Amino acid sequence: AMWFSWGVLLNMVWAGFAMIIVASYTANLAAFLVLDRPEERITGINDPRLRNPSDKFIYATVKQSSVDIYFRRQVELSTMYRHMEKHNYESAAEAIQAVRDNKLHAFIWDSAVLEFEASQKCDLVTTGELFFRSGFGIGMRKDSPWKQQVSLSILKSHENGFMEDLDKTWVRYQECDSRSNAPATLTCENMAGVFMLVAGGIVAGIFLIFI
Amino acid sequence: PFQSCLWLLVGLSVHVVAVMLYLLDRSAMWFSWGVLLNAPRSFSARILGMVWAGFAMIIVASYTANLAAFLVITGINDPRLRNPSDKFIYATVKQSSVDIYFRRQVELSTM
Amino acid sequence: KPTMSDGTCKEEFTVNGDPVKKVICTGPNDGSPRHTVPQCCYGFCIDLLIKLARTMQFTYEVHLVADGKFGTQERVQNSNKKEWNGMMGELLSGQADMIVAPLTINNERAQYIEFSKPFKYQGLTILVKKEIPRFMQ
Amino acid sequence: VESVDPLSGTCMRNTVPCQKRGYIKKCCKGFCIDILKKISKSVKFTYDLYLVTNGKHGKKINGTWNGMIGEVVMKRAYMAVGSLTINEERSEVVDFSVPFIETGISVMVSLEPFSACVWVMMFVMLLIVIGKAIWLLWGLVFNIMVSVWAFFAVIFLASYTANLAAFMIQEEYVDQVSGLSDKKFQRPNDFSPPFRFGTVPNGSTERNIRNNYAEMHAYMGKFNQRGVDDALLSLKTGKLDAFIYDAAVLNYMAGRDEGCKLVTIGSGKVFASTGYGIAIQKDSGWKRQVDLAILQLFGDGEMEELEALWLTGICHVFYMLGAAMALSLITFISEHL
Amino acid sequence: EVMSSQLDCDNMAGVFYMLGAAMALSLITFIS
Amino acid sequence: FNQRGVDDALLSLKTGKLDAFIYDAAVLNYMAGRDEGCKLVTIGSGKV
Ligand SMILES: *[C@@H]1O[C@H](CO)[C@@H](O[C@@H]2O[C@H](CO)[C@@H](O[C@@H]3O[C@H](CO[C@H]4O[C@H](CO[C@H]5O[C@H](CO[C@H]6O[C@H](CO)[C@@H](O)[C@H](O)[C@@H]6O)[C@@H](O)[C@H](O)[C@@H]5O)[C@@H](O)[C@H](O)[C@@H]4O)[C@@H](O)[C@H](O)[C@@H]3O)[C@H](O)[C@H]2NC(C)=O)[C@H](O)[C@H]1NC(C)=O
Ligand SMILES: *[C@@H]1O[C@H](CO)[C@@H](O[C@@H]2O[C@H](CO)[C@@H](O[C@@H]3O[C@H](CO[C@H]4O[C@H](CO)[C@@H](O)[C@H](O)[C@@H]4O)[C@@H](O)[C@H](O)[C@@H]3O)[C@H](O)[C@H]2NC(C)=O)[C@H](O)[C@H]1NC(C)=O
Ligand SMILES: N[C@@H](CCC(=O)O)C(=O)O
Numbered sequence A: 001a002m003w004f005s006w007g008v009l010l011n012m013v014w015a016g017f018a019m020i021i022v023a024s025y026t027a028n029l030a031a032f033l034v035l036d037r038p039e040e041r042i043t044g045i046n047d048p049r050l051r052n053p054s055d056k057f058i059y060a061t062v063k064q065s066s067v068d069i070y071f072r073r074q075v076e077l078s079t080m081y082r083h084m085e086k087h088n089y090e091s092a093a094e095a096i097q098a099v100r101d102n103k104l105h106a107f108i109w110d111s112a113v114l115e116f117e118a119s120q121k122c123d124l125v126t127t128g129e130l131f132f133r134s135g136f137g138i139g140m141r142k143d144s145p146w147k148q149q150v151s152l153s154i155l156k157s158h159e160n161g162f163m164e165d166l167d168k169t170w171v172r173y174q175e176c177d178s179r180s181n182a183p184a185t186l187t188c189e190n191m192a193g194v195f196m197l198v199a200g201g202i203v204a205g206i207f208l209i210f211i
Numbered sequence B: 001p002f003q004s005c006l007w008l009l010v011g012l013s014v015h016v017v018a019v020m021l022y023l024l025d026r027s028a029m030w031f032s033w034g035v036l037l038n039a040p041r042s043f044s045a046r047i048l049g050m051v052w053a054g055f056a057m058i059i060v061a062s063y064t065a066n067l068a069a070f071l072v073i074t075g076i077n078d079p080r081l082r083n084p085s086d087k088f089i090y091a092t093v094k095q096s097s098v099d100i101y102f103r104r105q106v107e108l109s110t111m
Numbered sequence C: 001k002p003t004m005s006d007g008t009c010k011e012e013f014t015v016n017g018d019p020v021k022k023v024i025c026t027g028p029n030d031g032s033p034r035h036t037v038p039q040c041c042y043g044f045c046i047d048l049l050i051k052l053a054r055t056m057q058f059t060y061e062v063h064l065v066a067d068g069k070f071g072t073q074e075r076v077q078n079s080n081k082k083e084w085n086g087m088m089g090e091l092l093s094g095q096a097d098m099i100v101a102p103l104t105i106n107n108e109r110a111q112y113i114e115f116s117k118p119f120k121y122q123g124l125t126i127l128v129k130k131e132i133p134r135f136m137q
Numbered sequence D: 001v002e003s004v005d006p007l008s009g010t011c012m013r014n015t016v017p018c019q020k021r022g023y024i025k026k027c028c029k030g031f032c033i034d035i036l037k038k039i040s041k042s043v044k045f046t047y048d049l050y051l052v053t054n055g056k057h058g059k060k061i062n063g064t065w066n067g068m069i070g071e072v073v074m075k076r077a078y079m080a081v082g083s084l085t086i087n088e089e090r091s092e093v094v095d096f097s098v099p100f101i102e103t104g105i106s107v108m109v110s111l112e113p114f115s116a117c118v119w120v121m122m123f124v125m126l127l128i129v130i131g132k133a134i135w136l137l138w139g140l141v142f143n144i145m146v147s148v149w150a151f152f153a154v155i156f157l158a159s160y161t162a163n164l165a166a167f168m169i170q171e172e173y174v175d176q177v178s179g180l181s182d183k184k185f186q187r188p189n190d191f192s193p194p195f196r197f198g199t200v201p202n203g204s205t206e207r208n209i210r211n212n213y214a215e216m217h218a219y220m221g222k223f224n225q226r227g228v229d230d231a232l233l234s235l236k237t238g239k240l241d242a243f244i245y246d247a248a249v250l251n252y253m254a255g256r257d258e259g260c261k262l263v264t265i266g267s268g269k270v271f272a273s274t275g276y277g278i279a280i281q282k283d284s285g286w287k288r289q290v291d292l293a294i295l296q297l298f299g300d301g302e303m304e305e306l307e308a309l310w311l312t313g314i315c316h317v318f319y320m321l322g323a324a325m326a327l328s329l330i331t332f333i334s335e336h337l
Numbered sequence E: 001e002v003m004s005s006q007l008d009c010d011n012m013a014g015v016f017y018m019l020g021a022a023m024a025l026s027l028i029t030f031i032s
Numbered sequence F: 001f002n003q004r005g006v007d008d009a010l011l012s013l014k015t016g017k018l019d020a021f022i023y024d025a026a027v028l029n030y031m032a033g034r035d036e037g038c039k040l041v042t043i044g045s046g047k048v
Helices: A002-009 A013-034 A066-072 A078-084 A092-100 A111-117 A145-159 A162-168 A188-208 B003-025 B028-036 B046-069 B097-103 C044-055 C087-092 D031-042 D068-073 D116-128 D132-139 D146-170 D204-209 D214-219 D228-237 D247-255 D287-300 D302-309 D318-335 E016-030 F006-015 F025-033
Strands: A106-110 A124-126 C023-028 C036-041 C071-075 C082-086 C124-129 D016-020 D024-028 D102-109 D242-246 D271-275
Touching: A002 A013, A002 D146, A013 D146, A013 E016, A066 A078, A066 C124, A092 A106, A092 A124, A092 C124, A106 A111, A111 A124, A111 C124, A145 A162, A145 C044, A145 D271, A162 C044, A162 D271, A188 D116, A188 D146, B003 B028, B003 B046, B003 D318, B028 B046, B046 D132, B046 D146, B046 D318, C023 C044, C071 C087, C082 C087, D016 D031, D031 D287, D031 D302, D102 D204, D102 D247, D116 D132, D132 D146, D204 D214, D204 D242, D204 D271, D228 D242, D228 D247, D242 D247, D287 D302, F006 F025
Parallel strands: none
Antiparallel strands: A106 C124, A124 C124, C023 C036, C071 C082, D016 D024, D102 D242, D102 D271
């Protein structure tokens, strides 16, 4: 009866309960892999942790920067500005290093930079939403013909694949990856533990149940 | 999924597997259909039978996974209401509180 | 990147075999004593500057910002005088002739200095540290 | 452009009046309309809006233009608002404002779970537990001390299914275009079924494609279609594979569609990065104030609101067996050794 | 809402109900 | 079983000294919406 039970379990009513236990095991193993942990992330600038910040969630930006100006000259961004104006860093590097060393909870900055830091570092991920769709330009002193020349040159640069190659050799040159598709493959650690347990039981069985 | 394409492909591959097994031996049908639906031993083609069992297990796993995959207005701020047309017709009760709500409001004119 | 022993940049190529160019850029070495030393600038804005120098034939002397910021206006120490600090602060003072850098095009800065067509249509997002990943029946 | 209100005889709602040529009255709304109203309320100037009756966006016939740009350079209209792509060509005769909407050229088309160590660990465990022993161990892996090894194998099956499902819920593969730097569009006659893709004539995308890749414009010379909606319907029908068109328009069209089958190429990348703008008279005095106005709209954040008001969207094995046959041929060579 | 299922340790849950029905069937098969 | 302080009661519920907590609807909804983690939740779909 032992060989029958252990044979049916490890592959009429007992076979039904065995098939049910196997199906339940497979279903639970699928549910504990296809899904994920409770959602905990920043949904953009409209996130409640930024609207009414505290000592728990500390976020800022680069001191004396475009973000600083953006948060400055606006009435509905008064609280956020008042909050950031006490944690701002002198450079972007120190801020990234801060949010990397778990000093900051968030860091407002350019997408062309933050999405680049998510390409050269898997521990740093950009937020959800995107605001202030501006752009980077060439600084020109007052009204100068060099402004028109440079602007025409940039227009001609975008006209072809110059900026495309400039992006493919600097921006698109990502070293890391994107975990948008979270369950990539099965962890080898679990299979290692299963192999350890199986080989252990097989060893103990070959040392006891053998003779 | 994949309709009768992958089905007839796996079927022709099964017939080719039985043909290759019969060519390696000199029964095969019972082995192929037996391994596929869950039987000569050895015959210098047992490895091909193991590979066929692997392909069968992969087929079963793929079928189960695909069977599990093919089984398992955003409010007032919906774009279908912000800029309506003759396709998305919506309204309310004439001379009601909703009517009053949408009436006296500058940003709720269009609706 | 810091210069070599004889003031030069290591000709490092790309993965495809592209010789990345570099230009000598004088700036600060590093609660912080003032010190001006030449360094090696290389990247997007540098290649773009090389392209602009290729199109419009003009010699250039690349240098870094005296401070660590970009360009924001601020009140003076006295008499309430609006003065810009940063790269724009150097551009208005004549210390610089052109700003080739991640310079956001906004309304406040445009009222003093002119901007060209956006060579990088970026935006403003948030950077957050990722969470914890890391036969058990 | 919506028709005027027949219940009054004039333009209704928050729409602005615009003529269309001997000209009839028509109401105008949308994104660039709100932008125009905002900058008219900022720069403070009265404006007479009207639809162009000579061409569309802007092209170059012989030596003169025949679009909105032509309407500007011929002193027939001071400014030009709407979907107008900025390039080096148009910016030569007229001027452009700071881009309020970023766009460009884009296209809109219609064993993995098991780790590499798992395959070696299974073969190593089968080697430890020969002759028929290997066949029994590998046979029990699929579908009395071996019983335990069966139990584990059962688990190994469960995971092999579970993970697979996960691997089916993770990866979202699609027939994405390999870009403009690919041979998939540079050589449509190379493959067996000729990829049918085209664009609109007299456009900025058509003027940029012919100046970046002659082959594209050469092949799309007969694959060109008139009308964006007609092109979309051609995509839905099956007479057209992909569509090369403006980025913003394609994004909105992908966001707002009768169904949800159409989608931009890739995650949302755009070749030839540019942006919409406002074409005004060359060497004018409004360029400065207009730029300051639009940038003020950027700083205020109203641009995001207007982008969420109008541009808002509602959408968005056997080969291994063949290798076993090669392994069977290698095993057939050892049998006759 | 992703975790592990243990089906608790109280009341009349699954499997045990099937074992009970099998016990009743066995009671009807042993008394026959 | 009366407890003083809403935060203390929530901390007691997170500790295990309190099974449930009967309190104002809005405060509990906000507290469940915004917390240190995502463990606390209102009874039912949102009945009051
Ligand atoms: C993108 O941009 C391109 C252009 O850049 C657009 O293409 C134009 O599209 C329009 C609309 O489809 C085309 O116009 C069509 O033409 C066809 C065929 O021609 C019709 O009209 C001609 C008239 O020309 C003849 O006659 C004149 C003069 O007539 C007589 O008297 C003259 C003086 O009194 C004398 O000088 C003449 O000698 C003559 O005796 C001649 O000058 C000319 O040589 C011709 O003989 C008729 O002859 C035809 O029978 C026919 O009716 C029409 O069928 C259509 O109705 C429409 O009018 C235009 O040709 C296109 N141009 C080009 C260059 O392609 C695209 O449409 C744009 N795309 C989008 C999406 O907007
Ligand atoms: C970053 O910038 C800093 C600038 O503030 C750099 O600091 C400087 O570093 C140098 C190198 O160590 C310091 O030492 C200098 O040495 C020279 C040489 O004279 C000596 O050697 C001769 C023999 O050759 C000997 O006969 C003399 O008696 C001296 O012993 C001196 O002339 C200088 O005065 C100086 O001592 C500098 O002191 C230091 N400058 C400052 C202002 O601190 C720093 O090196 C830079 N870092 C990098 C990585 O480049
Ligand atoms: N945006 C283009 C028209 C649309 C297109 O060519 O994709 C223009 O202004 O010329």
